């Protein structure tokens, strides 16, 4: 039967980028033609593979990651990028194989009084590895004196809220991202086009 890409794309609620969702897709026939030629995507970029080639390829597992970020930040969901998102929230490898798909979700994810449910990690000691997920909410120590879980000077809550309002500039409006990763092991493939 068919791979369930719709449960990822058509989902009514999306994850925050720091707690990005991953759906592991296995043991199914993937119909990329219908998936791609569907909604209108403001961003569609593939690396190491053509979108029109996926129907001929077989993979051991396929990963579909999804989250929400700012408009100005979509450029960071790409190989070899840096910034608050790529460093501290969601990181693709330099040799990334797969596709990044983004579309404006201002009608669904912004609120008149500001949507503060979507967050991104603002402070972190070091950068994330590729495909690493950090859901910690420990107070960030920006100075010498420890925090002991109490916010204060040099002691910051690690996550910040976007506050999406429906009439912000497009650079500040929420965008829904889906990232398709294609895992090729030396094992029998379970996903073919």
């Amino acid at each position, epitope marked *: 039967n068919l791979c369930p890409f719709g449960e990822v794309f058509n989902a009514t609620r999306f994850a925050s980028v720091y707690a990005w969702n991953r759906k592991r897709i296995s043991n199914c026939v993937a119909d990329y033609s219908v998936l791609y030629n569907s909604a209108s995507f403001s961003t569609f970029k593939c690396y190491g593979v053509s979108p029109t080639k996926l129907n001929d390829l077989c993979f051991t597992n396929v990963y579909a990651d999804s989250f929400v970020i700012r408009g*100005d930040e979509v450029r960071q969901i790409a190989p070899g990028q*840096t*910034g*608050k998102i790529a*460093d*501290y929230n969601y990181k693709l490898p330099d040799d990334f194989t797969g596709c990044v798909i983004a579309w404006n979700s201002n009608n669904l994810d912004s609120k008149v009084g*500001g949507n503060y449910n979507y967050l991104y990690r*603002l*402070f*972190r*000691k*070091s*950068n994330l590895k590729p495909f690493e997920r950090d859901i910690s909410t420990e107070i960030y*120590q*920006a*100075g*010498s004196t420890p925090c002991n879980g109490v916010e204060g000077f*040099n002691c*910051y809550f690690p996550l*910040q*809220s976007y*506050g999406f*309002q429906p*009439t*912000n*500039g497009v*650079g*500040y409006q929420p965008y829904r991202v889906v990232v398709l990763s294609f895992e090729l092991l030396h094992a029998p493939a379970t996903v073919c086009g």
Partner: antibody
């Protein structure tokens, strides 16, 4: 007792290089967003560069390819290497913690040091 | 790519009067991205208000900010001689940006 204390300013010839310093106390340089903002004589503020705690660096278009931001953890000090300097680089250079984004504003600020590019 | 514009260039008021400084934006900027800075002659800039309306630590109560979208306002309720300075608004889109600044001259 939080301070940012700058050094390394003065006279340099056109096309020369110069390294500014920003010694910190009351905060850890390697654990923060650390920025450089500059002010040409009689003019407004201009953001120049930023280093993230994770090591990422970013530069304004007017300095890309010529400036390099860095830090030294053991000395708890921020640096700015300025190469191929010209007349438009003559300014008072401030260092500051933060990047000017929500939850991450420029605070505190260094006292500034003046760089003069002339022959 | 969001340009901000401060107005007026210079402001001339007497002590005790009310000072209104504007920071207009071409596109609508969220309020949590707007900040105000004060720079007195020969000194470094100082953070006055962040998040459009939240007062910075130790800033006197006479300084207040408000606004949203394309129009942000810094208000100095009671103007004092020591308030003579240049005030900049500042926001972040893809990089940090500063407004041109507004000078507050004090009438005497």
């Amino acid at each position: 007792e939080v301070q940012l204390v700058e050094s390394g300013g003065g006279l340099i010839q056109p096309g020369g290089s110069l390294r500014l310093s920003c010694a910190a106390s009351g905060l850890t340089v390697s654990s923060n967003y650390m920025s450089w903002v500059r002010q040409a004589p009689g003019k407004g503020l201009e953001w120049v560069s930023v280093i993230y705690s994770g090591g990422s660096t970013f530069y304004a278009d007017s300095v890309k390819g010529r400036f390099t931001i860095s830090r030294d953890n053991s000395k708890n000090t921020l640096y700015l290497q300025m190469n191929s300097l010209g007349a438009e680089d003559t300014a008072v250079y401030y260092c500051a913690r933060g990047e000017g984004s929500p939850g991450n504003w420029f605070d505190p600020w260094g006292q500034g040091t003046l760089v003069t590019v002339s022959s | 790519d969001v340009v901000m514009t401060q107005s007026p260039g210079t402001l001339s008021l007497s002590p005790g009067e009310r000072a209104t400084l504007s920071c207009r934006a071409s596109q609508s900027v969220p309020s949590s991205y707007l900040a105000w800075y004060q720079q007195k002659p020969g000194q470094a800039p100082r953070l006055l208000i962040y998040g459009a309306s939240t007062r910075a630590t130790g800033i006197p109560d006479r300084f207040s900010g408000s606004g949203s979208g394309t129009d942000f306002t810094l208000t100095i309720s009671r103007l004092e001689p020591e308030d003579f300075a240049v005030y900049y608004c500042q926001h972040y889109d893809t990089s940090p940006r500063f407004g041109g600044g507004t000078k507050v001259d004090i009438k005497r």
